[PDB]
XYZ file of N, CA, C and O in Angstrom:
548
model
N -8.648 31.633 -27.985
C -7.932 31.965 -28.377
C -6.837 30.918 -28.440
O -6.972 29.732 -28.239
N -5.622 31.123 -29.379
C -4.508 30.026 -29.496
C -3.457 29.776 -28.792
O -2.498 30.641 -28.959
N -3.518 28.946 -27.633
C -2.639 28.460 -27.182
C -1.396 27.671 -27.976
O -1.754 26.329 -27.951
N -0.241 28.213 -27.472
C 0.918 27.604 -28.932
C 1.265 25.662 -28.128
O 1.105 25.360 -29.226
N 0.816 25.655 -27.214
C 1.683 24.281 -26.817
C 0.476 23.355 -26.742
O 0.455 22.061 -26.915
N -1.051 23.763 -27.223
C -2.270 22.915 -27.468
C -2.317 22.873 -29.256
O -3.288 22.277 -29.592
N -1.583 23.468 -29.953
C -1.420 23.519 -31.356
C -0.569 22.170 -31.792
O -0.334 22.112 -32.871
N -0.233 21.265 -30.709
C 0.692 20.123 -30.877
C -0.127 19.154 -30.756
O -1.077 19.089 -30.258
N 0.131 18.065 -32.147
C -0.774 16.991 -31.738
C -0.727 16.027 -30.469
O 0.676 15.846 -30.076
N -1.359 15.573 -30.120
C -1.937 15.121 -28.808
C -1.011 13.698 -29.141
O -0.836 12.852 -30.011
N -0.540 12.993 -27.557
C 0.131 12.014 -27.564
C -0.959 10.663 -27.838
O -1.756 10.704 -26.758
N -1.030 9.915 -28.634
C -1.863 8.660 -28.842
C -1.905 7.734 -27.499
O -0.809 6.960 -27.906
N -2.749 6.672 -27.289
C -2.713 6.094 -26.334
C -2.198 4.517 -26.699
O -1.190 3.778 -26.430
N -2.225 4.346 -27.997
C -1.945 3.430 -28.811
C -0.796 3.200 -28.916
O 0.410 2.215 -28.918
N 0.330 4.541 -29.001
C 1.514 4.711 -29.445
C 2.034 4.683 -28.294
O 3.715 4.152 -28.534
N 1.884 4.875 -27.176
C 2.342 4.889 -25.916
C 2.624 3.170 -25.363
O 3.574 2.489 -25.445
N 1.588 2.211 -25.941
C 1.524 1.289 -25.670
C 2.028 0.282 -26.681
O 2.959 -0.866 -26.176
N 2.126 0.588 -28.013
C 3.255 0.081 -28.868
C 4.554 0.120 -28.377
O 5.366 -0.863 -28.570
N 4.896 1.299 -27.650
C 6.423 1.746 -27.399
C 6.803 0.421 -26.224
O 7.675 -0.096 -25.682
N 5.557 0.306 -25.079
C 6.004 -0.723 -23.782
C 6.081 -1.572 -24.666
O 6.831 -2.390 -24.353
N 5.128 -2.103 -25.271
C 5.106 -3.655 -25.701
C 6.631 -4.076 -26.592
O 6.922 -5.229 -26.773
N 6.935 -2.884 -27.044
C 8.460 -3.151 -27.948
C 9.541 -3.168 -27.330
O 10.761 -3.435 -27.993
N 9.425 -2.497 -26.176
C 10.842 -2.411 -25.181
C 11.066 -3.683 -24.805
O 10.782 -4.820 -24.712
N 12.583 -3.888 -25.010
C 13.234 -5.189 -25.291
C 13.483 -5.489 -23.381
O 13.023 -6.745 -23.532
N 13.276 -4.717 -22.575
C 13.211 -5.158 -21.068
C 12.111 -5.943 -20.704
O 11.661 -6.691 -20.124
N 11.134 -4.638 -21.284
C 9.482 -5.371 -20.848
C 9.424 -6.747 -21.418
O 8.997 -7.358 -20.708
N 9.744 -7.162 -22.828
C 9.467 -8.352 -23.391
C 10.209 -9.320 -22.322
O 9.722 -10.329 -22.271
N 11.458 -9.050 -21.979
C 12.320 -10.246 -21.423
C 11.472 -10.549 -19.965
O 11.037 -11.651 -19.233
N 11.072 -9.453 -19.329
C 10.561 -9.089 -17.935
C 8.968 -10.102 -18.383
O 8.563 -11.043 -17.381
N 8.252 -9.940 -19.121
C 7.096 -10.690 -19.544
C 7.233 -11.789 -19.820
O 6.520 -13.116 -19.155
N 8.452 -12.716 -20.548
C 8.531 -13.704 -20.534
C 8.618 -14.452 -19.135
O 8.313 -15.448 -19.198
N 9.420 -13.518 -18.342
C 9.837 -14.312 -17.145
C 8.297 -14.492 -16.014
O 8.248 -15.506 -15.615
N 7.587 -13.445 -16.407
C 6.174 -13.274 -15.745
C 5.331 -14.587 -16.328
O 4.746 -15.507 -15.334
N 5.425 -14.786 -17.365
C 4.836 -15.909 -18.094
C 5.680 -17.227 -17.517
O 4.555 -18.342 -17.502
N 6.498 -17.589 -17.866
C 7.381 -18.317 -17.177
C 7.003 -18.944 -15.572
O 6.490 -20.155 -15.258
N 7.186 -17.793 -14.872
C 6.683 -18.121 -13.668
C 5.359 -18.375 -13.274
O 4.947 -19.316 -12.652
N 4.160 -17.545 -13.902
C 2.716 -18.034 -14.213
C 2.565 -19.547 -14.324
O 1.589 -19.881 -13.489
N 3.332 -20.008 -15.397
C 2.926 -21.628 -15.639
C 3.494 -22.348 -14.572
O 3.053 -23.345 -14.011
N 5.113 -22.201 -14.025
C 5.342 -22.997 -12.905
C 4.250 -22.890 -11.605
O 4.232 -23.849 -10.842
N 3.856 -21.427 -11.057
C 3.253 -21.427 -10.331
C 1.591 -21.614 -10.051
O 0.847 -22.756 -9.225
N 1.060 -21.640 -11.664
C -0.720 -21.388 -11.433
C -0.943 -22.441 -12.855
O -1.792 -22.630 -12.995
N -0.031 -22.980 -13.450
C -0.177 -23.988 -14.402
C -0.563 -23.245 -15.573
O -1.394 -23.996 -16.350
N -0.409 -21.728 -15.512
C -1.050 -20.998 -16.790
C -0.221 -19.880 -16.703
O -0.438 -19.034 -16.105
N 0.537 -19.859 -18.101
C 1.020 -18.917 -18.442
C 0.742 -17.496 -18.604
O 1.075 -16.325 -18.490
N -0.681 -17.454 -18.993
C -1.418 -16.164 -19.513
C -2.462 -15.865 -17.819
O -3.334 -14.907 -18.426
N -2.528 -16.560 -16.953
C -3.470 -16.285 -15.874
C -3.211 -14.414 -15.472
O -4.328 -14.063 -15.130
N -2.158 -13.917 -15.666
C -1.993 -12.441 -15.325
C -2.008 -11.534 -16.703
O -2.000 -10.336 -16.810
N -2.622 -12.106 -17.790
C -2.662 -11.393 -19.278
C -3.057 -10.327 -19.221
O -2.834 -9.071 -19.512
N -4.764 -10.508 -18.460
C -5.538 -8.797 -18.160
C -5.123 -8.031 -17.091
O -4.980 -6.882 -17.589
N -4.000 -8.718 -15.993
C -3.352 -7.488 -15.057
C -2.204 -6.690 -16.044
O -2.240 -5.688 -15.854
N -1.780 -7.478 -17.151
C -0.486 -6.765 -17.786
C -0.763 -5.506 -18.545
O -0.188 -4.530 -18.855
N -2.124 -5.988 -19.177
C -2.872 -4.938 -19.970
C -2.889 -3.794 -19.244
O -2.828 -2.735 -19.630
N -3.652 -3.662 -17.836
C -3.905 -2.996 -17.273
C -2.561 -2.078 -16.512
O -2.905 -0.767 -16.436
N -1.744 -2.879 -16.378
C -0.614 -2.280 -16.000
C 0.275 -1.336 -16.806
O 0.818 -0.284 -16.721
N 0.254 -1.726 -18.012
C 0.542 -0.998 -18.989
C -0.203 0.142 -19.199
O 0.549 1.121 -19.849
N -1.304 0.183 -19.091
C -2.048 1.561 -18.935
C -1.733 2.295 -17.728
O -2.050 3.321 -17.837
N -1.675 1.750 -16.722
C -1.710 1.888 -15.178
C -0.428 1.643 -14.439
O -1.238 0.400 -13.632
N 0.434 1.825 -14.564
C 1.668 1.361 -13.739
C 1.353 0.957 -12.366
O 1.633 -0.219 -11.622
N 0.523 1.903 -11.687
C 0.435 1.988 -10.232
C -0.308 0.755 -9.390
O -0.273 0.351 -8.552
N -1.083 0.045 -10.560
C -1.876 -1.021 -10.234
C -1.061 -2.356 -10.139
O -1.118 -3.323 -9.168
N 0.314 -2.199 -10.583
C 1.358 -2.763 -10.476
C 1.831 -3.328 -9.015
O 2.148 -4.197 -8.602
N 2.020 -2.361 -8.350
C 2.491 -2.271 -7.287
C 1.423 -3.022 -6.177
O 1.850 -3.957 -5.330
N 0.210 -2.710 -6.363
C -0.835 -3.374 -5.592
C -0.943 -4.688 -5.913
O -1.202 -5.638 -4.720
N -1.305 -5.280 -7.085
C -0.936 -6.476 -7.244
C 0.205 -7.381 -6.913
O -0.102 -8.410 -6.272
N 1.373 -6.784 -6.943
C 2.445 -7.527 -6.182
C 2.161 -7.491 -4.648
O 2.314 -8.866 -4.251
N 1.584 -6.635 -4.391
C 1.225 -6.915 -2.558
C 0.278 -7.982 -2.419
O 0.317 -8.541 -1.768
N -0.603 -7.983 -3.215
C -1.702 -8.787 -3.042
C -1.476 -10.364 -3.541
O -2.020 -11.202 -2.566
N -0.439 -10.426 -4.386
C 0.154 -12.015 -4.588
C 0.889 -12.484 -3.722
O 0.794 -13.383 -2.973
N 1.919 -11.573 -2.839
C 2.738 -11.797 -1.679
C 1.494 -12.024 -0.665
O 1.796 -12.965 0.384
N 0.720 -11.164 -0.354
C -0.438 -11.562 0.536
C -0.805 -12.996 0.637
O -1.305 -13.364 1.578
N -1.180 -13.548 -0.590
C -2.047 -14.747 -0.550
C -1.845 -15.114 -1.932
O -2.927 -14.759 -2.856
N -0.853 -15.683 -2.755
C -0.567 -16.367 -3.882
C -1.967 -16.953 -4.359
O -2.272 -16.867 -5.596
N -2.566 -17.845 -3.439
C -3.547 -18.633 -4.277
C -4.701 -17.676 -4.183
O -5.717 -18.414 -5.099
N -4.970 -16.421 -4.009
C -5.997 -15.915 -4.437
C -6.198 -15.775 -6.156
O -7.254 -15.541 -6.855
N -4.988 -15.756 -6.822
C -4.968 -15.793 -8.276
C -5.200 -16.888 -8.612
O -6.531 -17.139 -9.620
N -5.260 -18.214 -8.146
C -5.672 -19.476 -8.578
C -5.020 -20.282 -7.768
O -4.230 -20.030 -6.892
N -5.130 -21.696 -7.991
C -4.770 -22.725 -7.413
C -3.306 -22.990 -7.652
O -2.712 -23.105 -8.573
N -2.499 -23.127 -6.659
C -0.984 -23.226 -6.789
C -0.700 -25.013 -7.309
O -1.424 -25.658 -7.011
N 0.383 -25.384 -8.295
C 0.674 -26.191 -8.556
C 1.387 -27.033 -7.259
O 2.272 -26.620 -6.576
N 0.980 -28.182 -7.661
C 1.653 -29.119 -6.362
C 1.013 -29.643 -5.800
O -0.370 -29.149 -5.129
N 1.124 -30.872 -4.640
C 0.262 -31.672 -4.029
C -0.150 -31.175 -2.327
O 0.801 -30.426 -2.146
N -1.269 -31.127 -1.888
C -1.364 -30.365 -0.430
C -2.416 -31.225 -0.148
O -3.373 -31.181 -0.853
N -2.559 -31.764 1.154
C -3.574 -32.404 1.999
C -3.666 -31.796 3.208
O -2.886 -32.039 4.132
N -4.931 -31.203 3.475
C -5.037 -30.521 4.521
C -3.927 -29.395 4.695
O -3.557 -28.441 3.898
N -3.497 -29.326 6.101
C -2.199 -28.322 5.966
C -1.140 -29.033 5.913
O 0.153 -28.252 5.486
N -1.117 -30.079 4.942
C 0.665 -30.977 4.923
C 0.682 -30.461 3.215
O -0.025 -31.349 2.154
N 1.594 -29.685 3.090
C 2.374 -29.141 1.668
C 3.521 -30.525 1.475
O 4.327 -30.736 2.007
N 2.753 -30.479 -0.115
C 4.224 -31.255 -0.840
C 5.395 -30.150 -0.817
O 5.098 -29.081 -0.864
N 6.548 -30.729 -1.110
C 8.039 -29.820 -1.254
C 7.464 -29.034 -2.572
O 8.078 -27.914 -2.501
N 6.802 -29.682 -3.486
C 6.495 -28.957 -4.752
C 5.501 -27.600 -4.486
O 5.745 -26.790 -5.377
N 4.417 -27.743 -3.779
C 3.808 -26.936 -3.358
C 4.255 -25.747 -2.825
O 3.798 -24.550 -2.916
N 5.131 -25.916 -1.988
C 6.103 -24.815 -1.147
C 7.348 -24.191 -2.332
O 7.112 -23.131 -1.992
N 7.338 -24.891 -3.342
C 7.984 -24.365 -4.041
C 7.429 -23.579 -5.051
O 7.788 -22.226 -5.144
N 6.112 -23.557 -5.374
C 5.198 -22.809 -6.001
C 4.694 -21.561 -4.985
O 5.199 -20.658 -5.420
N 4.979 -21.868 -3.715
C 4.594 -20.589 -2.565
C 6.258 -19.861 -2.916
O 5.990 -18.424 -2.972
N 7.530 -20.153 -3.117
C 8.114 -19.420 -3.135
C 8.156 -18.824 -4.726
O 8.545 -17.780 -4.575
N 8.066 -19.396 -5.463
C 7.948 -18.943 -6.837
C 7.163 -17.813 -6.975
O 7.488 -16.500 -7.473
N 6.067 -17.795 -6.079
C 5.223 -16.692 -6.132
C 5.210 -15.272 -5.509
O 5.332 -14.043 -5.968
N 6.516 -15.424 -4.613
C 7.218 -14.077 -4.099
C 8.012 -13.488 -5.162
O 8.151 -12.205 -5.136
N 8.606 -14.395 -6.025
C 9.874 -14.045 -7.177
C 8.572 -13.205 -8.219
O 9.225 -12.441 -8.484
N 7.572 -13.961 -8.314
C 6.520 -13.524 -9.013
C 6.231 -12.012 -8.681
O 6.010 -11.002 -9.592
N 5.554 -12.051 -7.892
C 5.469 -10.684 -7.092
C 6.631 -9.700 -7.104
O 6.348 -8.865 -7.789
N 7.747 -10.010 -6.891
C 8.556 -9.121 -7.299
C 8.879 -8.677 -8.823
O 9.255 -7.511 -9.076
N 8.678 -9.678 -9.845
C 9.064 -9.582 -10.814
C 7.784 -8.472 -11.517
O 8.038 -7.774 -12.263
N 6.819 -8.671 -11.005
C 5.512 -7.591 -11.106
C 6.002 -6.141 -10.507
O 5.358 -5.029 -11.577
N 6.480 -6.177 -9.339
C 6.595 -4.994 -9.016
C 7.517 -4.169 -9.857
O 7.668 -2.993 -10.525
N 8.375 -4.914 -10.498
C 9.805 -4.628 -11.248
C 8.999 -4.204 -12.594
O 9.242 -3.254 -13.116
N 7.795 -4.806 -13.363
C 7.744 -4.779 -14.614
C 7.162 -3.326 -14.556
O 6.821 -2.639 -15.621
N 6.078 -2.862 -13.376
C 5.035 -2.310 -13.398
C 6.284 -0.663 -13.288
O 5.999 0.210 -13.646
N 7.399 -0.787 -12.526
C 8.683 0.363 -12.730
C 8.750 0.519 -13.738
O 9.216 1.759 -13.976
N 9.388 -0.456 -14.857
C 9.552 -0.210 -15.879
C 8.435 0.469 -16.807
O 8.972 1.493 -17.624
N 7.302 -0.034 -17.126
C 6.455 0.824 -17.654
C 6.273 2.081 -16.993
O 6.162 2.946 -18.140
N 6.504 2.487 -16.030
C 5.890 3.805 -15.669
C 7.658 4.863 -16.174
O 6.942 5.816 -16.661
N 8.353 4.068 -16.222
C 9.543 5.143 -16.587
C 9.629 5.171 -18.268
O 9.847 6.056 -19.056
N 8.957 4.169 -18.836
C 8.481 4.074 -20.161
C 7.514 5.026 -20.781
O 7.769 6.073 -21.562
N 6.453 5.180 -19.818
C 5.651 5.890 -19.919
C 6.059 7.671 -19.692
O 5.691 8.466 -20.412
N 6.903 7.988 -18.940
C 7.309 9.215 -18.426
C 8.366 9.675 -19.610
O 8.319 10.843 -19.983
N 8.771 8.529 -19.881
C 10.191 9.222 -21.177
C 9.215 9.409 -22.746
O 9.685 10.443 -23.314
N 8.470 8.603 -23.027
C 7.603 9.276 -23.901
C 6.861 10.165 -23.938
O 7.189 11.301 -24.921
N 6.152 10.815 -23.051
C 5.669 11.849 -22.537
C 6.760 13.202 -23.212
O 6.106 13.993 -23.400
N 7.552 13.030 -22.230
C 8.715 14.042 -22.071
C 9.200 14.112 -23.265
O 9.781 15.212 -23.930
N 9.388 13.097 -23.985
C 10.338 13.378 -25.749
C 9.083 13.974 -26.339
O 9.417 14.836 -27.618
N 7.445 13.576 -26.360
C 6.435 13.986 -27.326
C 6.438 15.788 -26.965
O 6.364 16.509 -27.730
N 6.835 16.030 -25.486
C 6.541 17.576 -24.755
C 7.927 18.313 -25.594
O 7.667 19.075 -26.257
N 8.899 17.627 -25.531
C 10.447 18.480 -26.330
C 10.125 18.430 -27.480
O 10.438 19.361 -28.368
N 9.899 17.486 -28.387
C 9.222 17.579 -29.820
C 8.520 18.857 -29.915
O 8.422 19.302 -31.246
N 7.307 18.676 -29.662
C 6.012 19.829 -29.678
C 6.890 21.244 -29.308
O 6.668 22.083 -30.355
N 7.702 21.212 -28.513
C 8.224 22.532 -28.172
C 9.539 23.068 -29.317
O 9.187 23.868 -30.005
N 9.971 21.917 -29.770
C 10.875 22.349 -31.088
C 10.199 22.478 -32.550
O 10.328 23.309 -33.130
N 9.012 22.208 -32.762
C 7.928 22.180 -33.556
C 7.501 23.441 -33.680
O 7.393 23.840 -34.679
N 7.377 24.006 -32.378
C 6.655 25.352 -32.051
C 7.750 26.529 -32.342
O 7.357 27.476 -33.179
N 8.944 26.282 -32.066
C 10.133 27.287 -32.058
C 11.071 27.409 -33.069
O 11.695 28.096 -33.172
N 10.937 26.206 -33.931
C 12.342 26.109 -34.759
C 11.783 26.853 -36.002
O 10.972 27.411 -36.253
N 12.630 27.725 -36.169
C 12.996 28.194 -37.728
C 13.764 27.246 -38.920
O 15.042 27.020 -38.888
N 13.015 27.070 -39.508
C 13.469 25.756 -40.632
C 14.588 26.391 -41.806
O 13.683 27.133 -42.804
N 15.548 26.467 -41.653
C 16.382 27.343 -42.564
C 16.595 26.296 -44.197
O 16.747 25.120 -44.147
N 16.563 26.922 -45.473
C 16.914 26.291 -46.424
C 18.503 25.179 -46.596
O 19.309 26.070 -46.732
């Protein structure tokens, strides 16, 4: 049988991704993440794969933010010299910037989560209108 809500076109994942990537706050946040990544790891794109997964699943952003702060060097070698236990000031600044990066990843994931929810809600609302509307001349 024909369930009215199922006669509505499905929301495509590519459309969700496109909306995320074009969001202005997402883009400013991503620029910060890249600049931090360059400062900390000497590689702007070190988290490029992670960003793609977070865009698809924001929950993984919370987990990544935790792991970065648990041990920044898990991601890769930190910028700045270090010999044995003795750290340069530059190395210590990389460790401090990793905390800022962790925070930015958490905030990025929250933004993604809201965008995804807003998109889904607007799509359902449009479907409902398309279903119930009477188009007058």
